[PDB]
Swiss-Prot record, chain A:
Transmembrane segments: none
Keywords carried by this UniProt record: Mitochondrion, Ribonucleoprotein, Ribosomal protein, Transit peptide
Residues of the full protein shown: 36 to 167 of 167
MF terms in GO: structural constituent of ribosome
Family: Belongs to the universal ribosomal protein uS3 family.
Annotated Gene Ontology cellular component terms: mitochondrial inner membrane; mitochondrial small ribosomal subunit; mitochondrion
Superkingdom to which the source organism belongs: Eukaryota
Name of protein: Small ribosomal subunit protein uS3m
Record organism: Mus musculus (Mouse)
UniProtKB/Swiss-Prot annotation, chain B:
Coiled-coil intervals, chain numbering: none
Family: Belongs to the RbfA family.
Subcellular compartments: Mitochondrion
Name the UniProt record assigns to this protein: Putative ribosome-binding factor A, mitochondrial
Organism: Mus musculus
UniProtKB/Swiss-Prot annotation, chain C:
Main location, first listed in the record: mitochondrion
UniProt KW keywords: Acetylation, Mitochondrion, Ribonucleoprotein, Ribosomal protein, Transit peptide
The name this protein goes by in its record: Small ribosomal subunit protein uS7m
GO molecular function, one term: structural constituent of ribosome
Protein's organism: Mus musculus
Subunit composition and interactions: Component of the mitochondrial ribosome small subunit (28S) which comprises a 12S rRNA and about 30 distinct proteins.
Superkingdom of source: Eukaryota
Covered range of the whole protein: 35 to 239 of 242
Modified residues (N6-acetyllysine): 194
UniProtKB/Swiss-Prot annotation, chain E:
Assigned GO CC terms: mitochondrial inner membrane; mitochondrial small ribosomal subunit; mitochondrion
Protein's cellular compartments: Mitochondrion
Domain S5 DRBM: 125-189
Organism: Mus musculus (Mouse)
Principal subcellular localization: mitochondrion
MF (Gene Ontology): RNA binding; structural constituent of ribosome
Protein name: Small ribosomal subunit protein uS5m
Keywords annotated in UniProt: Mitochondrion, Ribonucleoprotein, Ribosomal protein
Similarity annotation: Belongs to the universal ribosomal protein uS5 family.
Gene responsible for this protein: Mrps5
Compositional bias of kind Basic residues: 24-32
Subunit and interaction comment: Component of the mitochondrial ribosome small subunit (28S) which comprises a 12S rRNA and about 30 distinct proteins.
Record bears the keyword Mitochondrion: yes
Amino acid sequence: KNRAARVRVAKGNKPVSYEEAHAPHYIAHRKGWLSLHTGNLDGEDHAAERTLEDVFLRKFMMGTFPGCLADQIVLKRRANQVDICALVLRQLPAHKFYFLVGYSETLLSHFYKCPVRLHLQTVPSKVVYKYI
Amino acid sequence: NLLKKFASKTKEDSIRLRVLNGLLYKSLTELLCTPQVSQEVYDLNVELSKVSVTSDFSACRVYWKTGVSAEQNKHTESVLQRSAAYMRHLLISQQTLRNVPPIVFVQDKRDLVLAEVDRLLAEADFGPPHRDASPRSFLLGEE
Amino acid sequence: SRYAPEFREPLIDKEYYRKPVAELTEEEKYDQELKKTQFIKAAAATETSSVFADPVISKFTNMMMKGGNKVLARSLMAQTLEAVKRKQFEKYRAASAEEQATIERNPYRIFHEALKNCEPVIGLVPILKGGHFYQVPVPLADRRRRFLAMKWMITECRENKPRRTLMPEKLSHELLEAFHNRGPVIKRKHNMHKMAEANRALAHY
Amino acid sequence: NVQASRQESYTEDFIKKQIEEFNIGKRHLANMMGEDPETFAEEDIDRAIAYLFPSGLFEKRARPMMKHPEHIFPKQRATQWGEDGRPFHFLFYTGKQSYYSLMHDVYGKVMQLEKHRAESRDLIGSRWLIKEELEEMLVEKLSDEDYAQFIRLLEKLLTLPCGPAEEEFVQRFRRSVTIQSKKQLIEPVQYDEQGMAFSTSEGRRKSATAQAVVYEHGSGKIHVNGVDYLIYFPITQDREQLMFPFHFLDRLERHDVTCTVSGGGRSAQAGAIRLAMARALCSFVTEDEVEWMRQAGLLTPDPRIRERKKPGQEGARRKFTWKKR
Amino acid sequence: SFFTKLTAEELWKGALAETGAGARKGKKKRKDLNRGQIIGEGRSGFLWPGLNVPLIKSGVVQNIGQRSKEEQQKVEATMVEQREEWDRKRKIKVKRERGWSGNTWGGVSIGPPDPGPNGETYEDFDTRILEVRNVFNMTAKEGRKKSVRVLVAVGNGNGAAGFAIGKAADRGDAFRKAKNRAIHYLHYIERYEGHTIFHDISLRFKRTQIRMKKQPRGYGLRCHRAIITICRLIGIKDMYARVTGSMNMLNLTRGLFHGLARQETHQHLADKKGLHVVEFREECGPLPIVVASPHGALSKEPEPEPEVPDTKLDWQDVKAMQGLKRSVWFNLKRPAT
RNA sequence: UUGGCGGUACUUUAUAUCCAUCUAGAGGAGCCUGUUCUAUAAUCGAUAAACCCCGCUCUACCUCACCAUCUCUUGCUAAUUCAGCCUAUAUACCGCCAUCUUCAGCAAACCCUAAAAAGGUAUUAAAGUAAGCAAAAGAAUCAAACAUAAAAACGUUAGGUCAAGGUGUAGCCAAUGAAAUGGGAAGAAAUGGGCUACAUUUUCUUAUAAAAGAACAUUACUAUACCCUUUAUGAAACUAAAGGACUAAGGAGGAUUUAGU
Ligand SMILES: [K+]
Ligand SMILES: [Mg+2]
Ligand SMILES: [Mg+2]
Ligand SMILES: [Mg+2]
Ligand SMILES: [Mg+2]
Ligand SMILES: [Mg+2]
Ligand SMILES: [Mg+2]
Ligand SMILES: [Mg+2]
Ligand SMILES: [Mg+2]
Ligand SMILES: [Mg+2]
Ligand SMILES: [Mg+2]
Ligand SMILES: [Mg+2]
Ligand SMILES: [Mg+2]
Ligand SMILES: [Mg+2]
């Protein structure tokens, strides 16, 4: 049996999101890609470096917004610009989010030497695709 | 209690199985040579190749010499099978064997093959020569 | 298979399609109208309306082919037919008028009558009963009877020939020697039938 | 012990609001794309959504959609009773009010025809609607026994004398059988600068592709890639494959063919040409002949192509040896 | 390395080892480590305006700062106290009352049944367990599957009571199924003056014999522990009962409700015979008390009084009045029921 | 009263399927390679189906985890009586899989029974109902079909993997940690898989698989061994390729067994 990225069946009481519900073979069929860069296109270089930056950027955002992320972040690179699109729960006060955006943007712009912007869409609670 | 009774909803083996097979064939051949089982069964003029009793003794398989016509064989199969339960009764009642297994009727088309070979062989060119169950956790407030 | 079960085998008979409508049996007439609403398989690469195409010889070519080398197998069969035609032409020219009549110079007719002379009516299927090998007389179908004749020829030539002889020269010498009912392949057929006679009693098993 | 949420039931008030939001959506989508709201249509909506939200997901159910609520939502999930709680249909408590309401009408029709008292094949080449189509008309789930019983009642209606009202009724439950024409698509007949007639057609065998250019009048001169066919095809079986189209229609020595085959091997290139010639030669033969070609295999593309190798086995079907146990 | 670090959800899944070959076919406890952490609080004690301290204080825009070594040690110790206090809260529990024994489920209240379809609350009803069987059955899933069969009773203490059997693989599920099924089978039991049965009741349900007796006020419930439990749910306060034969809990529950729901009130007897029903209490002297008068027409034919009644008497009841010594176990001092 | 159990048969259903049929193989020779054994101062893991060109889409140093010798003791990091550990347990686990398997089932909420240990179907219908997961459908192989892939739940084998990484428990901390140098050998052995050959449907040469001219049994076919030269990568040839001669065995392989519709 295949155990990869499959949120296994419980007893109908586990709330899975749309992204979690779909197994790897549904990538490019029902669900898209969380990161979009040009480094895996044919005849393009720097796939290794773009992928390493993504791994870090996901661990950074989880720790910087602990318990406030409703779903996985979406990374969008255009030219040298990096854009982080995160669904965040409305737990923290509004002014605290302005602090973490100013901090996380400046810190990651001086670390990777690119303009980095953070885009946050606030949800009242995690969105449940189905109960499995 | 009639309705209750008749609804009925709910090296030793090698030598023993060489005697039951021979005797059952000897006995079932005699049963089918008279109208005793039925008039339909008597007119079918069925012949018996051999009887094979299973090692478990779960069933008794009777091999009957199939014919050319499928319709003749399909009719013979239905008539023979319907009366198989009755045939077993007649063998226990005449005291052939004290215990007889469920009779099953299998086809034996081998007699047709042997006739075919002899036809070709004559015509052939030979050639020139408890803790969880108990209320302790419930009554302590843990749950 | 890449053909759905609804596809129909193609019919490559030139005369059949051009026959007058009244000359066709109503059963054949029905199939033509039905096929108009069916799917037809594409014809094979070796299926043509040629008047020189013989199915029996085409099958014999495929049974000699090794590793998909059809060009070589067809070449060997073409050389065989020529080697048989040239062997009869020599005999015909070097024979009296009376003898000349009997001599057959058609290689296609020597090939068909040779194979037919090597086809066995009955067969032997080896069985194991009680720890011994009891082979028993069997009857062979029209397909099994033809396959055995072709297989026995392609195997006598492949194996029981001198090292420097070639297949077109051993096969030609066997089609003609079989065509007269005296070859070793004919003996293989005779041995099959004689064993079946010996095993007449063991047919029951 | 249930956390899975109830399957959502849609009130008529809910769907009604979904249709006002959609109607305001169209006016916005029209304003975005610079089109006129009055004429903006479902087709224009789907095209605009595809431009503004490009998705390359292979399954089209998973792509963005801005459809009318009647489409996305099930047609009839509305309340089956009013404020007082009294159902709207007298057959509500049966559980299949729509299936039994239809079986009530057809049974009453049958009784009037039988009490009141020609060929019944008014419609031909038609089929009874499949269970899935019936379920769509009723808007309720049906079993196989329910569908089978419905058809028997409709058949009995046809058996009896039928006025034009009955014929229109049974028509609703008759769907025209799909008409797949198994008849070759004849190519046009172009004209050259010299003025000679000629037809062209493509052919594909394995990885080889050919583009034949048969001429109506010729002496049988076939040129493959600007070469003769005896030179280009030194193998007899390849030439025999080119002979099959013309020999079959007894048209040898009557046409001049110009071929251009690229790709594949010798046999795949001859096979590709054979189909290309058979399809081009259709324009110069009678329809009865074109059917004889189609029924002899000359006009069907061969779908047999090399199968991919599988990981963990030696070949497409060949398996690695099962190590001796 | 920073890249070999996993999230808390994955770390606890591995450490707890709940899903494993040993667990299914035959203790580590999970903890949340982000419970007390406030965003912006670090070991170094830095103060971040807008994150962990006020952005503006007394009208002054704050700037970055760090707490002194003494101040930070206090904050560290305070959090340690709160964690220990939180752990103490986890240890603290509200003990529930036992039933007929400390390790048995019989007699244990499990609350009211759940609300109904249209917000029909049952807060006035109490549920009691009577039997809990934990039996293993044979099914292809695990070879031998587990099952819990629970018999419960419900009542509002005002005459309405019912019982049901619930089965499930989990004990919690059996409790829910039995509790909500019993609310659909509510008998109404007639109580004389709200505290006792209208008359003596003797019955045999299968092999379980029950013999109930009407008693005066203050007598209490001198009955089988299961009958005491149900009588409290029904609202009976004073009665005697004896159970003989088999002690099957289901037959005793079914037999009890069968007799209590088939009893004849005084008004019913007055209507059936047309005569007055009169009561004579020894504490009221010869004073006749009228407890029920016929609704329709009062008859004038006296009820026949036989010289010697043909009643079928129980030796157990009569034996006492004959002067025969009782058992040492009879009429012992017991707590108020 | 349920379940289990059979070494149970008969009847269907299908299966590159037990047997039968078909084709090329394996089992014999020479080599390449894995494993076991022997064996070395000198790893580890897999090791019936479901290990054996397996982790390795790869070991001359490195890789490296092993052996011998010498050497360092706050010894990668901002801080830490700390760093570090391929130390033990896959029978504590996560992660990622094998196996039955493209087998058809697994789990939960309700309702019903003169009590339920359980059961719940009848279609001209008699108490069952309504949602999930798998299958199916859909999508992919850029028309269409078919086919192929992908998919395949719950469980079974305490199956595989503490040595991908992480990690519970136990253990080392002048050593079970770190680093440098040099080594990690072989086989009158067994066995698995692969490769090549045993030739005439062949060998060599030109073309090209067309055709032609030669060779064709003692070395004719025939060495991807050994040995000898040269070139390639490298710091290092112990590696690979190309020639050269040398040429031994091999003459189509016992039972038995593998794959293919
Ligand atoms: K595991
Ligand atoms: Mg192959
Ligand atoms: Mg106690
Ligand atoms: Mg080394
Ligand atoms: Mg080293
Ligand atoms: Mg070490
Ligand atoms: Mg394991
Ligand atoms: Mg192991
Ligand atoms: Mg598709
Ligand atoms: Mg599928
Ligand atoms: Mg194990
Ligand atoms: Mg060390
Ligand atoms: Mg050649
Ligand atoms: Mg060099």
